[PDB]
Amino acid sequence: NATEIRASVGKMIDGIGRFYIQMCTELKLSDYEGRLIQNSLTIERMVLSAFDERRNKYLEEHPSAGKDPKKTGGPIYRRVDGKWRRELILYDKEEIRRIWRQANNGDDATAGLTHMMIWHSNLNDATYQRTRALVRTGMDPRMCSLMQGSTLPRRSGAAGAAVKGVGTMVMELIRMIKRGINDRNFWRGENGRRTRIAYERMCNILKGKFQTAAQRTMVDQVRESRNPGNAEFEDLIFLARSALILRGSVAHKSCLPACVYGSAVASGYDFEREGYSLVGIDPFRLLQNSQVYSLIRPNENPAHKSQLVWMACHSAAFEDLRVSSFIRGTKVVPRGKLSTRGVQIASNENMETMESSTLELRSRYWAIRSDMRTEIIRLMESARPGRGVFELSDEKATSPIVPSFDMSNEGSYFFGDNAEEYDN
Amino acid sequence: NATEIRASVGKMIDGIGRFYIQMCTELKLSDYEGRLIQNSLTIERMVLSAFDERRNKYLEKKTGGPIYRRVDGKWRRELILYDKEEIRRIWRQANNGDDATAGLTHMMIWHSNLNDATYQRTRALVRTGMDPRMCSLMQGSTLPRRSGAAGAAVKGVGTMVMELIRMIKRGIRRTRIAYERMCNILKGKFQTAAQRTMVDQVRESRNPGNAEFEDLIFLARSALILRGSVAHKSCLPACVYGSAVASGYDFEREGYSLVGIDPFRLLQNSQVYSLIRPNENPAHKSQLVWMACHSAAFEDLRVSSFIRGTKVVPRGKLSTRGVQIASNENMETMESSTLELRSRYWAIRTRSSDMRTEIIRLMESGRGVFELSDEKATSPIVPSFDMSNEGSYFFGDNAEEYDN
Numbered sequence: 001n002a003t004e005i006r007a008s009v010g011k012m013i014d015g016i017g018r019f020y021i022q023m024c025t026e027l028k029l030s031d032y033e034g035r036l037i038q039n040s041l042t043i044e045r046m047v048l049s050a051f052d053e054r055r056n057k058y059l060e061e062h063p064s065a066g067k068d069p070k071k072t073g074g075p076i077y078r079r080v081d082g083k084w085r086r087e088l089i090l091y092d093k094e095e096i097r098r099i100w101r102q103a104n105n106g107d108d109a110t111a112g113l114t115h116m117m118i119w120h121s122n123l124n125d126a127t128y129q130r131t132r133a134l135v136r137t138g139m140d141p142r143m144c145s146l147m148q149g150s151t152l153p154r155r156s157g158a159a160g161a162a163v164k165g166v167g168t169m170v171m172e173l174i175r176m177i178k179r180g181i182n183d184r185n186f187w188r189g190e191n192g193r194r195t196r197i198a199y200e201r202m203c204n205i206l207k208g209k210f211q212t213a214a215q216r217t218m219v220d221q222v223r224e225s226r227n228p229g230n231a232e233f234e235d236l237i238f239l240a241r242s243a244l245i246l247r248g249s250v251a252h253k254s255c256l257p258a259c260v261y262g263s264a265v266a267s268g269y270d271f272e273r274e275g276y277s278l279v280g281i282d283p284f285r286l287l288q289n290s291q292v293y294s295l296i297r298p299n300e301n302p303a304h305k306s307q308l309v310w311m312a313c314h315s316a317a318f319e320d321l322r323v324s325s326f327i328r329g330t331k332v333v334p335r336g337k338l339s340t341r342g343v344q345i346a347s348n349e350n351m352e353t354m355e356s357s358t359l360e361l362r363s364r365y366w367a368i369r370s371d372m373r374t375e376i377i378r379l380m381e382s383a384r385p386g387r388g389v390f391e392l393s394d395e396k397a398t399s400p401i402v403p404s405f406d407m408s409n410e411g412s413y414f415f416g417d418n419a420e421e422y423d424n
Numbered sequence: 425n426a427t428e429i430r431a432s433v434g435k436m437i438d439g440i441g442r443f444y445i446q447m448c449t450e451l452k453l454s455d456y457e458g459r460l461i462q463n464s465l466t467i468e469r470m471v472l473s474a475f476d477e478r479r480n481k482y483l484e485k486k487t488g489g490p491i492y493r494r495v496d497g498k499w500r501r502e503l504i505l506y507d508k509e510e511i512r513r514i515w516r517q518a519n520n521g522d523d524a525t526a527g528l529t530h531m532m533i534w535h536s537n538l539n540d541a542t543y544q545r546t547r548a549l550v551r552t553g554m555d556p557r558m559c560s561l562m563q564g565s566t567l568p569r570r571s572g573a574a575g576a577a578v579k580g581v582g583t584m585v586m587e588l589i590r591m592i593k594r595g596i597r598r599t600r601i602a603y604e605r606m607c608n609i610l611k612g613k614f615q616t617a618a619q620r621t622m623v624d625q626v627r628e629s630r631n632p633g634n635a636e637f638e639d640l641i642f643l644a645r646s647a648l649i650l651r652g653s654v655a656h657k658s659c660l661p662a663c664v665y666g667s668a669v670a671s672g673y674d675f676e677r678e679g680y681s682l683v684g685i686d687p688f689r690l691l692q693n694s695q696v697y698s699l700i701r702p703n704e705n706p707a708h709k710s711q712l713v714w715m716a717c718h719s720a721a722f723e724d725l726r727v728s729s730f731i732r733g734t735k736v737v738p739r740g741k742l743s744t745r746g747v748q749i750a751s752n753e754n755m756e757t758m759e760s761s762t763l764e765l766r767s768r769y770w771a772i773r774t775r776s777s778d779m780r781t782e783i784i785r786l787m788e789s790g791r792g793v794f795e796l797s798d799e800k801a802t803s804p805i806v807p808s809f810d811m812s813n814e815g816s817y818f819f820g821d822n823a824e825e826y827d828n
Contacts (some may be wrong), residue, residue, distance in 0.1 A: 131740065131820045141820020142741045241812045336546065336556050373812070380811055408645050408784060414554025415819065416546040 006275020012111045013261050014271040015344060019047065019103030019112075020262025026099070027089065027407045033078050037343055037359065039260035041123075042074035044116040047100050050093035051113050057155030058113050060120075062424060070095060075345070077295060084295060084354040086345070113271040114159045119154070119255035119312070121163065124151040126308055126317035126413075127342050128422035129335075134167075137174050138233065139240060143167045144414045146243045148250055148318050151422050162251035164317070166243035169206035170236045173199070175376060177228040177236075187227055199228070204237070209248040212379050215239060218372040236330055238373060245380040246337060252285040252315040252369075284366035285392065288315055292341055296355040301339040306359040309343060311413075313361060320411045326403050327389055329364030336416035365389040430679040436527045437665050438675040443471065443527075444519035444666030450514065451504070457493050461698040461713065461763065464663035465538075466490050468531050473530055474512040476560055482532050487511055490749070492699065499699065499758050501749070529574045534568070534659035534716070536578060539566035541712055541721035541739070541817075542746050543826035549582075550668055552589055553637065558582045558644050559818050560722050563654050563819035576609045577655040580722070581647035584610035585640045592632040602629070602740035610643075613652045618782035619643060625779070642780065650789045653776045654718045658687040664694045664717075685799055691717060692796060696763045698747065705743035706761040712735055712744055713763050717818075725817055727811045730794055733768025737811075740820030768795035768804065 023043050024034040033039060048058035051074035056091075061067070073090030101108060131141040133150075146167030152160050154172065176199055181184035203223035203256060210216045222228075222235045253279070261322055264286060266272065276282050294305055311317055311332065316324045324332040369387040388400040447467050448458045472483035474646070486714050519527065541638030545565055546556040561582030567575045588606055591599070607627030622643055626636045659682070665721055666689055680686050691714075700709050715721055715736065720728050728736040749758075774791045792804035 077548075133821075135741055135820070140814050141738065142814060142816070144820070192451070216624065238812055332706060337550050377810065377812060407788070408780075409640060410555055410557060416550070416559070 003275070007193060007272050008111070009274070010274060010276035011272035011277070012109065012115060013105045013276050015104035015107075015221075016112045016115060016258050016365070017261040017263075017265030017269075017271070019100050019109075019414040020258040021155065021266050022099055022103055024262065027076060029076070029078065032356075033076075033292055035259055035263060035291055035293050036077060036154050036356075037257055037292055038075075038077055040262075040344055041120065041344065042076060042259040044120065045074055046091065047096050048113055048117060050096040050100070053093075054111045056153045058117055058153065060151060060153050060424065063065075075160065075347075077345070077351075079356065084205060084351050084356065086349075096326075102157070112146065114156060115255050115341050116217065117156065118159065118253050120165055121149060121152045121342065122315050122317070123309070124422060125149070126335075128412075129417045129419035130422060131417060132421045134181060136173075137171055138237060139167070139171065139174070143170075143240055144245060144417065145318050145412070146240060146248070148252075157201070161233060163253065163383040164205070164209075165250045166206065166209055166248045169209065170240040170243075170373040173202050173206065174233060174236055177204075177233055180227075181229055181233075199223070200401050209250060210243075211238070212242075212246050213240055213373040214372050214379060215246065218376065219374065227316045235373075238376075242376050242380060243320060245383045246365060250318075254278050254315050256283055256286065256311060256313050257292065257309075260286065260290060279370065281366045281390075283313070283393065284363060288300065288392065290359070290361040290364050292359045292361055294357055294359050295345055296357045297341060297349075297402070298353050299339070300341065300353065300355075302357040305343060305357070305358065306361060307338065308340060309359050310361050310363075315361075315422065317413055319413070321406065321413055322405050322409050322411050323387065323403075325409075326395060326405055327363050328368055329362075331409075332413075333398050334410050334413050334415060338418065342420065363392075366392055368397075427679070430681050431676065433682070435524070436524060436530060438669060439519040439522075439524050439527045440531065440662050441667075441669030441675070443515050444468075444520055444662040445670055446514055447471075447511075448666060450506075451491055453493060454811040456697065458511070459663055459667065459695060459697050460492055461661060461663065461758070462490065462492055462749060464661040464666075464696075465535070465748065468535070468662045469603055470506060470585045471515050472512070472528060472532060474508045475523075477508075479570050480568050481572065482540045482568060483535070484508040484568045487735065494760075494781055498759075501755055502752075507632050516785055525537070525572075526574070529572060529609070530657075530659050531662060532571075533564075533578050533657050533719075536564050536567045536575070537657075537659055537721075537745065538713075538716040538737070539826060540564070540719075541715040542823065544739075544818075544821045544823040545826055547820065547825045548828060549586070552593070553587055554586060554589070554641060555645065557584075557648065559821070560816065561585075561644060561647055563656070563722055566828070572578065578657055578719075579609065580654045581610065581611075581613050581652050582644050584613065585629055585644040586786045588626075588640055589637055592634075592637055597715075603632075607716075613654055614643075614647070614650075615741055616650060616783075616786060617668060618779045619650065619652070621777065622779040622783075625777070630804060638828040640680065642783075646783050646787060650783070651746070655776075656773060658682045658717060658719050659774075660687060660691060660694070660717050661757075663696055664690065667694065683773050683775055685770045685794075685796070686765060687718070689796065691765045692767065696765060697760050698763045699749065699758055700761050701745060701753065702757050703743070704745065707734075707764065708737075709747070709761075710764040711742065712747065713767050714740060714767070717765060721817055723817075724815045726811070726813050726815055727791065729813065730765050730807045730809060731769050731771055733766075736817075738817050738819060740818075740822050742823075746824065750807060767796075770796055799808040 052059040072093055072094050075087050076087045077084055130144055130147050132145055132151055134141055146165045149164030149168040203219055207216055207219035222232050225232050296302055296305055321332050367387045386404040434798045466489035470487045473487040474692035487508045491502035491504050492499050503587040546559055547564055549556055549558055561580045564578040565583045604627045607623055611620050622639055626639055632826040633778055700706055725736050769789055771793050776819055793807055
């Protein structure tokens with residue numbers, strides 16, 4: 001009865017796994033070099049590009065960006081003579097899509113591709129700041145915590161729609177109103193019919209992220225305008241702030257690096273059989289016996305580069321730092337006090353100085369988890385200031401541990417942000 | 425009761441005013457040039473430099489600074505170096521030959537009040553093992569190492585916590601008393617029983633320990649919810665005062681008070697011009713100044729916005745860089761505009777053992793505006809605020825980092 005879920009999900013993991021393995025052997029990579037998180041992001045980026053096929057549903061590709069329409073690739077890092085060297089592979093999109101498909105027993109693994117996409121998205125969320133893009137749109141920097149999903153493609157709507165946060169939605173809509181406001185043709189014409197229906201869908205997606213009946217119906221008013229302008233702009237900004245106090249309903253799926261799935265199947269793990277869920281202990285324990293490395297930079301804190309990957313693996317960048325901590329097993333500080341610069345490596349980076357380290361990716365527990373303006377305001381005035389944890393070994397919900405939180409500690413991951421700005 | 429304090433301060437304003445007028449003449453600037461903010465800061469800094477005399481109590485060959493005089497359609501960066509005694513002598517003269525201890529500390533807090541709305545210190549907080557969120561407890565954080573009991577009056581909970589922590593962390597007879605003293609000040613900043621206590625116990629620890637690093641850090645955090653009582657002092661540029669007296673206004677006799685409408689009315693009718701780099705928003709540069717004048721950086725933006733009459737945005741939205749100029753900024757990309765230093769309404773300053781369980785327990789659990797025309801506080805407007813608007817001047821702070 002409950003067999004189907006483990007399988008469709010475990011069978012999804014399996015394929016991501018098989019695919020990674022083949023990909024590594026194909027690339028003549030060593031265990032360490034395969035468990036290198038930087039090589040893993042580069043291999044995932046590669047499968048989505050072929051399935052993307054220039055439609056921005058699976059990839060975040062630029063519009064003017066210079067990359068061969070029928071051939072994807074990325075940087076690979078292998079340790080030779082002790083020094084880390086930067087290699088640059090390039091594969092035929094076919095190789096990727098044929099190898100991917102074969103990894104999945106002839107199926108197009110669309111869940112898998114969405115799983116990897118959401119994982120890159122979670123990482124980005126825990127790594128890059130958005131305030132500079134917020135201000136330019138007319139939004140506020142505090143709206144940074146309504147940003148989950150902002151560096152995701154506007155395609156793969158349901159998935160995007162589930163993981164994206166109010167701000168990401170407000171931000172999207174806010175832009176159309178501009179390009180519509182600015183271009184005269186924008187809402188009239190075949191593009192109005194094509195975009196108007198888009199604009200709308202977006203409103204509904206946003207709308208279905210709100211809880212209070214006032215927010216919901218206010219979005220409706222905003223979507224009923226046939227010529228969105230300054231007025232609808234202030235309303236979305238308004239909704240955007242209401243989200244700060246009356247939190248929305250945003251999905252959060254714990255996706256892990258392919259190398260972590262690829263590493264388990266190759267050790268003998270049979271997922272589709274045992275089964276998988278992203279809800280319970282599966283991603284916690286799979287993370288538990290984790291052995292994921294990372295090129296680390298001169299003067300970076302290995303402990304910190306790890307918090308980052310930890311944080312993205314469990315979808316906790318927008319998580320009250322006191323909640324996360326109780327579960328991590330160690331304080332989970334604000335980005336501002338971190339000392340890494342990202343788990344990527346720039347072309348410009350001097351690899352002569354490059355280091356290598358073992359991410360600490362486990363945890364101490366696992367856990368389960370006009371008139372209107374006025375109605376909303378008050379709902380905010382009256383607003384008031386958690387999840388159930390279980391020891392790893394308590395497979396089932398036999399005994400919920402109580403949380404002993406510390407309420408005097410930093411809760412926000414964004415106050416005093418030090419991260420880079422996500423140009424792309 | 426009232427009359428003396430209001431006079432004695434009044435005489436201080438008058439002193440600065442005069443001192444500024446005079447120096448204005450030795451430096452021989454035109455009315456416009458004499459109303460330029462950078463010129464007021466540069467003469468203001470001289471006065472303090474001289475009287476300080478390398479002890480780090482006021483301002484951190486001779487004393488000098490940049491003098492901006494516009495001829496004949498570009499501005500020039502004049503760098504004058506004046507005698508340190510010629511300047512302080514001139515200060516005595518404008519003050520009847522009296523040390524304006526109050527007068528000097530007044531211009532000082534003004535600069536502190538400026539730096540406060542202009543520079544971010546989150547970076548120093550973190551280097552000291554503090555919270556960024558503690559950024560709104562940094563009043564007077566940019567005050568001199570040797571700052572008296574008037575300035576320390578203008579110091580925030582986090583400024584004292586920082587100062588204290590930076591000392592235990594530093595090595596690991598009079599440092600003791602000193603470090604006991606700071607603890608006393610911090611103490612006079614809390615409003616509750618338990619908050620005071622921990623401080624006592626803190627200055628009380630026989631030898632500095634990690635318990636305080638934590639205990640101070642913990643108290644610094646309580647002040648964020650259990651607001652304390654840090655003294656704010658509305659201090660205006662010297663130009664503003666100088667000008668006023670040139671008007672003939674006679675502060676010593678009319679009486680002045682920073683606790684009231686005075687600082688406001690003097691600014692309402694006060695005309696200051698500032699240099700403005702290119703692509704900067706004169707209105708934001710004005711916000712910056714207005715804020716510093718009323719000593720309102722750590723104030724809730726909604727209350728500030730109400731009083732001002734116009735939105736007072738977060739420093740992360742401010743299209744400015746600062747009120748000073750470096751020796752590397754082209755003067756042929758410079759020009760000036762008027763600093764809008766007015767307000768819609770004027771307000772009252774609202775003149776003001778497990779300790780962690782009392783504290784935490786507490787934690788979990790009328791500044792009225794009046795028309796500028798209502799001098800006597802005869803009618804109180806109940807500010808109608810909107811909590812949709814932003815309250816923290818600091819979230820997203822992109823401001824330059826001050827370096828202590």
